[PDB]
Write a protein that binds this ligand. Structure first.
Ligand SMILES: [Mg+2]
Ligand SMILES: [Mg+2]
Ligand SMILES: [Mg+2]
Ligand SMILES: [Mg+2]
Ligand SMILES: [Mg+2]
Ligand SMILES: [Mg+2]
Ligand SMILES: [Mg+2]
Ligand SMILES: [Mg+2]
Ligand SMILES: [Mg+2]
Ligand SMILES: [Mg+2]
Ligand SMILES: [Mg+2]
Ligand SMILES: [Mg+2]
Ligand SMILES: [Mg+2]
Ligand SMILES: [Mg+2]
Ligand SMILES: [Mg+2]
Ligand SMILES: [Mg+2]
Ligand SMILES: [Mg+2]
Ligand SMILES: [Mg+2]
Ligand SMILES: [Mg+2]
Ligand SMILES: [Mg+2]
Ligand SMILES: [Mg+2]
Ligand SMILES: [Mg+2]
Ligand SMILES: [Mg+2]
Ligand SMILES: [Mg+2]
Ligand SMILES: [Mg+2]
Ligand SMILES: [Mg+2]
Ligand SMILES: [Mg+2]
Ligand SMILES: [Mg+2]
Ligand SMILES: [Mg+2]
Ligand SMILES: [Mg+2]
Ligand SMILES: [Mg+2]
Ligand SMILES: [Mg+2]
Lengths: 101, 100, 128, 115, 153, 211, 83
RNA sequence: AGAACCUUACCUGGUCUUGACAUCCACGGAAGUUUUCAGAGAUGAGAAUGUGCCUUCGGGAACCGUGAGACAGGUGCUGCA
RNA sequence: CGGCCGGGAACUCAAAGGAGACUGCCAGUGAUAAACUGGAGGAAGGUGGGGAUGACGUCAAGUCAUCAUGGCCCUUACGACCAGGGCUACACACGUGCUACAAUGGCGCAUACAAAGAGAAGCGACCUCGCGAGAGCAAGCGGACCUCAUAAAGUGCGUCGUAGUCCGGAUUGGAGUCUGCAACUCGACUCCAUGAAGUCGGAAUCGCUAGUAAUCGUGGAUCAGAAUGCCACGGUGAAUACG
């Protein structure tokens, strides 16, 4: 059976690692073998905006939206493991994309 | 900006989506390499007949909360001032003052 | 043998140095030192640590480097060789420290700052 | 040393020496030399007249000198007589390709004259 | 500065001869951080200078520096309402720095075809005391001896 | 001079975001626009319900709005009717289905937004600015604020020339990032223009952070 | 310049006006606001009043004008000197 | 943090007046889609295609047009309210 | 003969959590002090480097044209729609940048080393055609995977030999490509041809204390197309501080 990969994306480090811990621990408990987590490189957008409504070109604010990525690979899935994963709900605002094979 | 300007933007978007297919096909036949020259001429004439505002290059992005025609940011859809306001109020998720 | 290993970093460069006793061969990134460093200053900088320990011709060092440029990679290699030699003996500490090769130069490019055309250069000021 | 009336320098590598001709740039000079079959580096010295005559044929292919000057002047005259905007700009001695005129147009306006 | 706390920037000896004087000379000749080309020019100039002179590989350089080294210079000073020119003795580090700077200037202000040739000819002329840098040193010393009367202030 | 927004500088350190969801570039702006519309509607509809904070989360293809208010009974209505109508119209605004939760703020006098709203309402309802701001600090310190500062500004009492005045009790360290400083603002539209009121409330420091 | 593969541009309204006028031999100046249309050989001899933004200026189309734009024969800025 | 048109706030000329943009009221038609002509376009004349959804079958909702009003609209002045 | 593929979690790296640096130790100075200088050890030594952070207040500073608002003013018009023009003019002055004035260089050939980012009405590979801008077909990629995307300066070899030049690229004519309803006023880029001024710049004046100045390339926002500006990334990398 092909392994199932779970890519978790979030704007928070602690929240994404909490969800990842939940997933990996569940997988270990339900008799699955899991090769994770892998901390993939985190994107960091940047934005620079004038804070002065008129002129004052040198007054600026730089902001950032850091996007964290975690990869959990579950090799050799079982129906029991998959059902446990299904019935486990993850913290909101954390995106999860599942690639299959 | 003026309510009339914002309404004008809405009208332009409406027309642009309305004539998308015709604009695309007419442009295709106009620029087709192996096309009848007479057909290409007819297609050019039809494209000229089509409404000006239908063109998707005649619409300008404007701040979705005020309408400011300058300083737009596609990521948020707002201008600099409103972006700063929302960022401080913590309504834009993830946005934070950063230093490196 | 023991393949005494040392990592070295300079500017934005990273070099992994493996030391093994034998001849005095230096292969960098599957290339020779002469081919890799057309700059004789860089070649001398890579030679420096082996000369001070005086164990140059008796050690074969393989080095793999990434990042930075000529001088950054040369410095990373030198620092890695210092650490690997330390791994090899640990007696050399006094000599290499007194030479100054053990320290990891922390100098880095400063970030471009708002209002300044460069890291510290400011736009020309007209009085009137 | 004589190509369409010009005294090609006899001490400069051929292609660069051939660049002297009004109408033969470096690209056309290379093209002419390659078509004739002469090395670019060899100067006019050590070039027999026969090679010079082959170069004369190759140069004769291109429109160079008085004829080219004539073509350029006649094109400008055509624009001016036609009465177009470009003609008006060529008649007022101001930038004709849409460069700014409020300042930094001295190349066309000529050296500055005070008020 | 105001705090009067300055730490000298340690330099590294030149790779070929191991002379900090040569390293400083290379730095002074450098432009736009092109150390590779400045070091190449300095090495070539030293080679041709050694051949021309007929001496060791660093002693000609030392002779030229000895001949262009200034002992004293003038500092503008305002002591008693008068704009005095006080001749001050310069410390040896500044002596060497000024000597090298003048040599590089004189070389850059020559007519020869290449920088290595200009530097070699300038070093030879300085060694024989007939060049621009040595003329500048003599002018400075003459100016100082002229106003020796204001040595205190 | 000009000072950084306290909540803005402290976001991610000791303060949570009001909006907490993930979205790719294809829908980030749409989510922000829907958020703005929903918050505007809810704030106006609940202007008289003492709403302190509207937290919008976007679980999957749904939107959960949590309204922090000091008057839960008014917002809820008899057996949930008012919550139901608010949800039914928030679902319209958002497009996706909506759910509404209500969080009571136990001690409103320690809430910056509620304090600012009270002061603004009093000013519009014709009260002495000094009396109003002094009364809010006293109440805040009574309820136990580690520190509080109120700043009223602009044509106080109908004066022709606008002036700024501010009271401050306790300690309000605005340069200490680990400090918990709940800051908010309000504008009073009175017969002689807009009067701005800024309120800082310092309620202790946070060492572990916990973001 | 406009790409060769697309052809020379002309506005349909001007095309139709010139076609009708040339076929019927009319000599009334064609009052047009299209300064972007290209002068085609079929228009030679006709008088076209191209708008400069204030008033239409008559231009007698001629053989030498083929290929140019109509707008290139209607200066829009009046410059008569500073001093 | 980016004027060919659009932006656009300026000028010429052509146009509209409860209005480009809203809430309310009444009447009449689902909207919508396809083509012809006049005009620079804005709009005007038309023509085919058009009977959507709840429907307590009383009719409603959305949508469009018409008509009168309250009102809309103002990038118009005062940053010395 | 490519980490490519079996294979290994060693190493670079990728994040997340922690340790570490505090005049802590030694010697000297100093008032039995604060504090300062030097040394050891250490990756770093005295705020290790850089940034965010801007007290009470001054300038009735700037913004009624982002927005909100009091008072005023218009209501078949100072409101609204459309096409063309203008914001791009040009005798002149001031400010900010780019390019050079050459040989520490120009041109030609071969060759090496980065970092940080962006991408779905998007980035667009390979192959074919075009001198070139690009075109046709079209893989892959919501991306440590695919593309943008060959970094340049450097190094090696040749030539140029101090010229207004094989420096300089302005201007200008012809012919083109792309975006776009449409490049005349008024785009960008390509090719061919022309090769202005300029040979280091008065009084005066600006920036900068180290990975800084200087020099060389790269990316992004805005954007159908349109940076020598703005914001970021790295490569090479100094002089001086007596006072
Ligand atoms: Mg990415
Ligand atoms: Mg408005
Ligand atoms: Mg646009
Ligand atoms: Mg030490
Ligand atoms: Mg221009
Ligand atoms: Mg500030
Ligand atoms: Mg315009
Ligand atoms: Mg009018
Ligand atoms: Mg003011
Ligand atoms: Mg104000
Ligand atoms: Mg004022
Ligand atoms: Mg006034
Ligand atoms: Mg120490
Ligand atoms: Mg501080
Ligand atoms: Mg008005
Ligand atoms: Mg217009
Ligand atoms: Mg302008
Ligand atoms: Mg420059
Ligand atoms: Mg050369
Ligand atoms: Mg060049
Ligand atoms: Mg590139
Ligand atoms: Mg080279
Ligand atoms: Mg050249
Ligand atoms: Mg050329
Ligand atoms: Mg001259
Ligand atoms: Mg010269
Ligand atoms: Mg210079
Ligand atoms: Mg300093
Ligand atoms: Mg640059
Ligand atoms: Mg971009
Ligand atoms: Mg662009
Ligand atoms: Mg840099």
């Amino acid at each position: 059976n092909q392994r199932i990969r779970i890519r978790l994306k979030a704007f928070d480090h602690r929240l994404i690692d909490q969800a990842t811990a939940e997933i990996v621990e569940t997988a270990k408990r339900t008799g699955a073998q899991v090769r994770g987590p892998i901390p993939l490189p985190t994107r960091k957008e940047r934005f620079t905006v004038l804070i002065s409504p008129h002129v004052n070109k040198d007054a600026r604010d730089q902001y950032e939206i850091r996007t964290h990525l975690r990869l959990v690979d579950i090799v050799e899935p079982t129906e029991k493991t998959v059902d446990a994963l299904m019935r486990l709900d993850l913290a909101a605002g954390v995106d999860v994309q599942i690639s299959l094979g | 900006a003026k309510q009339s300007m914002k309404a004008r933007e809405v009208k332009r978007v409406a027309l642009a989506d309305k004539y998308f297919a015709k604009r695309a096909e007419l442009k295709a036949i106009i620029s087709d390499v192996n096309a009848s020259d007479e057909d290409r001429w007819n297609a050019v004439l039809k494209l000229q007949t089509l409404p000006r505002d239908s063109s998707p290059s005649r619409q300008r992005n404007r701040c979705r909360q005020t309408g400011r025609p300058h300083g737009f940011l596609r990521k948020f859809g707002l201008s600099r001032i409103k972006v700063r306001e929302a960022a401080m109020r913590g309504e834009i998720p993830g946005l934070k003052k950063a230093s490196w | 043998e023991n393949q005494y290993y040392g990592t070295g970093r300079r500017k934005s460069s990273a070099a992994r140095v493996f030391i093994k006793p034998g001849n005095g061969k230096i292969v960098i990134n599957q290339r020779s030192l002469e081919q890799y460093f057309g700059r004789e200053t860089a070649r001398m900088v890579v030679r420096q640590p082996l000369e001070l320990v005086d164990m140059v011709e008796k050690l074969d060092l393989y080095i793999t480097v990434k990042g930075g440029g000529i001088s950054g990679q040369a410095g990373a290699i030198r620092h890695g060789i210092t650490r690997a030699l330390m791994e090899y003996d640990e007696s050399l500490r006094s000599e290499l420290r007194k030479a100054g090769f053990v320290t990891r130069d922390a100098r880095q490019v400063e970030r471009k700052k708002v209002g300044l055309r460069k890291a510290r250069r400011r736009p020309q000021f007209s009085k009137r | 040393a004589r190509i369409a009336g010009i005294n090609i320098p006899d001490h400069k590598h051929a292609v660069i020496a051939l660049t002297s001709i009004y109408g033969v740039g470096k690209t056309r000079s290379k093209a002419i030399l390659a078509a004739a079959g002469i090395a670019e580096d060899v100067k006019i010295s050590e070039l027999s007249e026969g090679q010079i005559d082959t170069l004369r044929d190759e140069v004769a292919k291109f429109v160079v000198e008085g004829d080219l000057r004539r073509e350029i002047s006649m094109s400008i005259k055509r624009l001016m007589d036609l009465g177009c905007y470009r003609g008006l700009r060529h008649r007022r001695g101001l930038p004709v390709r849409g460069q700014r005129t409020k300042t930094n147009a001295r190349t066309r306006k000529g050296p500055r004259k005070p008020i | 500065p105001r705090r009067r706390v300055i730490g000298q920037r340690k330099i590294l000896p030149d790779p070929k001869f191991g002379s900090e004087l040569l390293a400083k000379f290379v730095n002074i000749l450098m432009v736009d951080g092109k150390k590779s080309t400045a070091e190449s020019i300095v090495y070539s100039a030293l080679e041709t200078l050694a051949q021309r002179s007929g001496k060791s590989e660093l002693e000609a350089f030392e002779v030229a520096l000895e001949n262009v080294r200034p002992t004293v210079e003038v500092k503008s000073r305002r002591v008693g309402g008068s704009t005095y020119q006080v001749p001050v003795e310069v410390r040896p580090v500044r002596r060497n720095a000024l000597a090298m700077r003048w040599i590089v200037e004189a070389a850059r202000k020559r007519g020869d075809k290449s920088m290595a040739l200009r530097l070699a000819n300038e070093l030879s002329d300085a060694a024989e005391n007939k060049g621009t840098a040595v003329k500048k040193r003599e002018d400075v010393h003459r100016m100082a001896e002229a106003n020796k009367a204001f040595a205190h202030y | 001079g000009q000072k950084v927004h306290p909540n803005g500088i402290r976001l991610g350190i000791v303060k949570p975001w009001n909006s907490t969801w993930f979205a790719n570039t294809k829908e980030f702006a749409d989510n922000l626009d829907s958020d703005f519309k929903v918050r505007q509607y809810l704030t106006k509809e609940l202007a008289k319900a003492s709403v302190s904070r509207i937290v919008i989360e976007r679980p999957a293809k749904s939107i959960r709005v949590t309204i922090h208010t000091a008057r839960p009974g008014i917002v809820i209505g008899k057996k949930g009717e008012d919550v139901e109508k608010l949800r039914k119209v928030v679902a319209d605004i958002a497009g996706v289905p909506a759910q509404i939760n209500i969080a009571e703020v136990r001690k409103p006098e320690l809430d910056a937004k509620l304090v600012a709203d009270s002061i603004t309402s009093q000013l519009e309802r014709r009260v002495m600015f000094r009396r109003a701001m002094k009364r809010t600090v006293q109440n805040a310190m009574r309820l136990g604020a580690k520190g509080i500062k109120v700043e009223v500004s602009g044509r106080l009492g109908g004066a022709e020339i606008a002036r700024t005045e501010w009271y401050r009790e306790g300690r309000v360290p605005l340069h200490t990032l680990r400090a918990d400083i709940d800051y908010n603002t309000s504008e009073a539209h009175t017969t002689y223009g807009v009067i701005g009121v800024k309120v800082w409330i310092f309620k202790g420091e946070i060492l572990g952070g916990m973001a | 310049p406009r790409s060769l593969k697309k052809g020379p541009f002309i506005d349909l309204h001007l095309l139709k006006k010139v076609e009708k006028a040339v076929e019927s031999g009319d000599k009334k100046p064609l009052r047009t606001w299209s300064r972007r249309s290209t002068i085609f050989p079929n228009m030679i001899g006709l008088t076209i009043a191209v708008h400069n933004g204030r008033q239409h200026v008559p231009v007698f189309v001629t053989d030498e004008m083929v290929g140019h734009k109509l707008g290139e024969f209607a200066p829009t800025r009046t410059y008569r000197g500073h001093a």
